[PDB]
Design a protein around this ligand. Sequence first.
Ligand SMILES: Nc1ncnc2c1ncn2[C@@H]1O[C@H](COP(=O)(O)OP(=O)(O)O)[C@@H](O)[C@H]1O
Ligand SMILES: [Mg+2]
Length: 392
Amino acid sequence: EAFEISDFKEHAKKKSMWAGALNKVTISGLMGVFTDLMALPIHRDHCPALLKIFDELIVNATDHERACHSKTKKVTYIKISFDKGVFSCENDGPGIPIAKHEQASLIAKRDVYVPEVASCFFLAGTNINKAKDCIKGGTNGVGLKLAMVHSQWAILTTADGAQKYVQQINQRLDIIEPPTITPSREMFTRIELMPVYQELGYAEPLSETEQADLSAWIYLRACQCAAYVGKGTTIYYNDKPCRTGSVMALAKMYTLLSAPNSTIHTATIKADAKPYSLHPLQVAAVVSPKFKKFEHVSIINGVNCVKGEHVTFLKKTINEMVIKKFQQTILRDSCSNIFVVIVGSIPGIEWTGQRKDELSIAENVFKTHYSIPSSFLTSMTRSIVDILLQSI
Ligand SMILES: Nc1ncnc2c1ncn2[C@@H]1O[C@H](COP(=O)(O)OP(=O)(O)O)[C@@H](O)[C@H]1O
Ligand SMILES: [Mg+2]
């Protein structure tokens, strides 16, 4: 028919490329935390874009944590809330600067302050020009805008130690209210919003099962955050601390139902050269005959990554050992009883899309730079070969 020209807002309300499907679909490997913390599958369809806007706020807070972990004022908390359908994320550390943005003001022909650029201008942020070694997850300058475009109402609040800035952003970014600016001694950034649940396939208000599923998924996402952030940061979900600060605790949570009292093989995968040497990768793995296929949970640069060559590196290395030790005794066969958690930062990665589901890298990065400790390989191989010798 006709050739139409869209704007960002209308395009994002219609197109799955930005955040995933805009209706409920079957999400492979969808999990949530249920309370002992136990991660369990959610066998109901859910809207990927809805889960992504929660993710975009959580990764923004994790990014600020990494950015500040060496400065005077660090991020000491990330507080995530979900109640009556309202989602919020708050972190301390330096606020978004409360200042006029000259370029944005000229574009919009009115006064625009920096926090309005951060929340309302597509393709805008502090990572548009991104260093080659940056390990923040943010890159595109769209994540916070997508959260606004999928919100019936939203409130951005930020304080910089001298002033507080409050701005309402309503009706899927159609209405940007002028901000309120007052003196303040607080220092934080808070986003609070109500998603357009009904447009994304949910009930108005959330049904009992929808509410329980979403709360479980957010709780697990906060727990994944807690394993990734630095030592001086606490993550809260509905004011309870998420006490899963290690890959070991995450591995336990995922295997508590299926392999209780399991042995957890641990490793720190290290590199000798900067920038890789700044960024150890923490690994915890469980080997059980009860597991039916290889599975991993990877939190890389604060993002839940479902595919990447970092996984392949580990699998290929274990497989090599398993084949040798199996042959002396007598890839799918060698790894199908493994569950592994990998958490850490990797400099210089790219992605396959806005959702950051798959990281993109040369496999030689791991061959050249990283080393998997022999004690971990030996102990994993012993456990895997025993399972294999049973079947025989
Ligand atoms: N919780 C937060 N704390 C501090 N700054 C934030 C926060 N969330 C967003 N920002 C700022 O707003 C900008 C826009 O966020 P976003 O649209 O997600 O882009 P990015 O791709 O940079 O993450 C970010 O680059 C960052 O500078
Ligand atoms: Mg972002």
